[PDB]
Curated annotation (Swiss-Prot):
Compartments where found: Cytoplasm, Cytosol; Apical cell membrane
Residues where N6-succinyllysine is found: K126, K144
Sequence positions that bind NADP(+): 10-21, 44, 161-162, 210, 212, 214-215, 262-264, 268, 271-272
Modified residues (N-acetylthreonine): T1
UniProt cross-references to PANTHER family, sorted A to Z: ALDO/KETO REDUCTASE (PTHR11732)
Subunit structure: Monomer.
Top-level taxonomy: Eukaryota, Metazoa, Chordata, Craniata, Vertebrata
Residues where Phosphoserine is found: S3, S37, S210
UniProt name for this protein: Aldo-keto reductase family 1 member A1
């Protein structure tokens, strides 16, 4: 039944939050309204999603002084984008996020990726051919600049997104403020058991994006199976009288993995938080474990002579070259 986990700061972070990744500015306000009505108290944002101003307007309607949801009862996460890794750019980036969201502080602020892109006002400084120009700033230097934000009261907790185990330990080796959360892709095809175990041994909680297996990206590999249609998922759905999405989310809830499924659909937004009133047996958890196959959907790609290949795997700080 328990619906949050404790961060090392003492903060309660709800096990289900609303993902705003891919939510267009024109649609995100309705999504936020529906989520708040459905009982969501955790919203996951990022500057690069290009919709924080609209999210700020939506939250201002029902969150804060004298409003239905007091500010302290909402958990808001945002993320520092790849072009803002230079120490001088870190606080201005956070301040811009706070201005757009119309907030005094964030509950959690993440480094969106461990690797940096060329500094400037273009989030994707691309060459004519589509590649992105890189920057050499190390994530340890960016981390030190992030730590200052906690002392100023602007952010309650800091964390990491798309870091691997080696990179997490590297941050830990120099940290004066400890990361509280790792956010990565996670679902039964990419169960992240090794990386989750690693985080638990380091005191970090884990947040899963793409917990429903990115069926919106299925067309990229049309002969691959769809996670939501896996026979074991369908069988669990029938046994428990729950939707396949609820099966995939409950699996993570029971693993104590926070989930941030992205949606603007009112029926799916509602469904996605109704995961605290049924339970899987040890046998069922092991059946879901059988799906693990190291299939990663979320990798930046680029088309080269009619084929999609990884775009960023040559960056010195790329996270996906190690086993975990």
């Amino acid at each position: 039944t328990a619906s949050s986990v404790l961060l090392h700061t003492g903060q309660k972070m709800p096990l289900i939050g609303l993902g705003t990744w891919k939510s267009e500015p024109g649609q995100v306000k309705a999504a936020i309204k529906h989520a708040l009505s459905a009982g969501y108290r955790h919203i996951d944002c990022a500057s690069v999603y290009g919709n924080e101003t609209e999210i700020g307007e939506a939250l201002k309607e029902s969150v804060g002084s004298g409003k239905a949801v007091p500010r302290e009862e909402l958990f808001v996460t945002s993320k520092l984008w790849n072009t803002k890794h230079h120490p001088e750019d870190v606080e201005p980036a956070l301040r811009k996020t706070l201005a757009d969201l119309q907030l005094e502080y964030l509950d959690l602020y993440l480094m969106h990726w461990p690797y940096a892109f060329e500094r400037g006002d273009n989030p994707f400084p691309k060459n004519a051919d589509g590649t992105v120009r890189y920057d050499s700033t190390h994530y340890k230097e960016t981390w030190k600049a992030l730590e200052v934000l906690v002392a100023k009261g602007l952010v309650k907790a800091l964390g990491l997104s798309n870091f691997n185990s080696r990179q997490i330990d590297d941050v830990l080796s120099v940290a004066s403020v400890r990361p509280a959360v790792l956010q990565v892709e996670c679902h039964p095809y990419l169960a992240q058991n090794e990386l989750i175990a690693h985080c638990h041994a380091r005191g970090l909680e884990v947040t899963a994006y793409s917990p429903l297996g990115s069926s919106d990206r299925a067309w990229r590999h049309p002969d691959e199976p769809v996670l939501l249609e896996e026979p074991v998922v369908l069988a669990l759905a029938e046994k428990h009288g729950r939707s396949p999405a609820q099966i995939l989310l409950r699996w993570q809830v029971q693993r104590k993995v926070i989930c941030i499924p992205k949606s603007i659909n009112p029926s799916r937004i509602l469904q996605n938080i109704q995961v605290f009133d049924f339970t899987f047996s040890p046998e069922e958890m092991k059946q879901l474990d059988a799906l693990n196959k190291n299939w990663r959907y979320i990798v930046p790609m680029i088309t080269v002579d009619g084929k999609r290949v990884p775009r960023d795997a040559g960056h010195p700080l790329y996270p996906f070259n190690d086993p975990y």
